[PDB]
Design a protein around this ligand. Sequence first.
Ligand SMILES: [Co+2]
Ligand SMILES: [Co+2]
Ligand SMILES: [Co+2]
Ligand SMILES: [Co+2]
Ligand SMILES: [Co+2]
Ligand SMILES: [Co+2]
Lengths: 301, 301
Amino acid sequence: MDTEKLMKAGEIAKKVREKAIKLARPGMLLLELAESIEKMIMELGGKPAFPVNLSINEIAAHYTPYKGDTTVLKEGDYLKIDVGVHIDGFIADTAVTVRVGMEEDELMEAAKEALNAAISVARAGVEIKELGKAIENEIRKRGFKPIVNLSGHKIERYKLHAGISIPNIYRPHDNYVLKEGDVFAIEPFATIGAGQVIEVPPTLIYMYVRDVPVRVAQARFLLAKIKREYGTLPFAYRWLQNDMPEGQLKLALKTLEKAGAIYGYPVLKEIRNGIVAQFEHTIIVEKDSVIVTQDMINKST
Amino acid sequence: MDTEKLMKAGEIAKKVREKAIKLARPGMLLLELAESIEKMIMELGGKPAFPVNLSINEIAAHYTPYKGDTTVLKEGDYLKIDVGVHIDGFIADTAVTVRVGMEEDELMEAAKEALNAAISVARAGVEIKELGKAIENEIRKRGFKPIVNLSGHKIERYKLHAGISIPNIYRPHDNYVLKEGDVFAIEPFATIGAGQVIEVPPTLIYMYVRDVPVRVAQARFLLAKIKREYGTLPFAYRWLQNDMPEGQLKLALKTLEKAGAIYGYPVLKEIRNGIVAQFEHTIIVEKDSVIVTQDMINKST
Ligand SMILES: [Co+2]
Ligand SMILES: [Co+2]
Ligand SMILES: [Co+2]
Ligand SMILES: [Co+2]
Ligand SMILES: [Co+2]
Ligand SMILES: [Co+2]
């Protein structure tokens, strides 16, 4: 059922996340890491909810390797491993920051404790603004800044971002009350920069939006492909690299973007190039003591 | 009818808004201005969707006069007039900034243009992120900063803040898709300060949030009155200053808050005391959105 499938996605996400952390050592090629992770997900009976994100230092999110990517992990690098798994549409979304070859530092602890404080107050009947306050307080109290344009989000079947979000700053009108059964991802983002991310090249992730008319055949068929293979879930440029020539692929995606058929999600980096840390868990809201699907499994595997 | 009542609410809000501007002259007592406005709304056949807010300079919002308030408008003051009207629950929400006894300046122009830019791209099928994008670019381009924790919001029957917001900055994940029938208030806030607001005393606005048991007789009766006359819409401390002595009223309100029956909304000011400008309109999504808070429009295509 619902809960069962969700917890199952959570269990897989957890195993996959731990393995990634163990593989995230100096010299490790990002492409190999992303591949191993997505492979483990399928062999465990699940499917990726989106391409595994591996964002380093000032890159906050939306970075997933591509065939030919020579990028490798370096000691001291602040690697954000964001993995998502779904079972029949029920999504588990989790993330961690690892400082390659080193222990967690103050900045990383800020994001992790912000997440703990948010889960501590997150329960049925509480307004979202309360989580934002708790998150903002932990980050600023420790001397860092929260990212104002990246945060948590409601999750629904086959819908990574259901609409309602969980800010990392307190907003007086976030009066939305968490209901039992609600599925939310809480993602505190802390930085030493300004506290805002900007889009920058290249675009490695895309998502299907609408079924608009496309005159260009190659683009029109790429859309029909995307629509049925990925549906409403994010996909990686990497996942399509062996389908058609790089050149043609790049132009077909661009056409779909301008046509408004799909949305491109380029790399997000801190505006002042500030190091970014992130931690995330998916939880099921319940009358007090919410369940953390990506913790130790406590609902219905 | 449905859309009929909504349009009517906007008609009244518009007339009252334009009248408030004419009355916003040097020496005008805030208490007098609010009273005149709220009185005009009722004689016009409508009811305040909330107490008329009159927020000056670094005060962004949530300020409404009270019995005994001697504050008056001073020439050169950046007064933001935010007025709301509802017809049987259908709410119209609009606002404008006026530089008392003077003409529009740089800051004000930015906020107003930001609102026009959002409305321009607002149509069924568009993701909210596109509104935030247009808003931020108009404000940033003129050298000002948009307030990151105060913005637009979805509106529903007897529900000023439905849940979904329209930020004044670009957030990559605000993927909510505007759909026909949707009612939204676009509320750009611009400042020369840091770009964030904080809650500060006093608390002049409250709002019924939950039907919780209240034993205390005096506080219990006050709650019955609230639910009876204000329902789930915001109300002013001012609207209750004639029912009982200040002391009892304060304790009564504190008791209702402690029980979690009502929620207080304290004044909001720019964190760096920077001047704040605001402009706002309520729209109803269609094949091509229509502004509720303005004179009616033809068919055309
Ligand atoms: Co994302
Ligand atoms: Co995630
Ligand atoms: Co997430
Ligand atoms: Co408000
Ligand atoms: Co308003
Ligand atoms: Co509003």
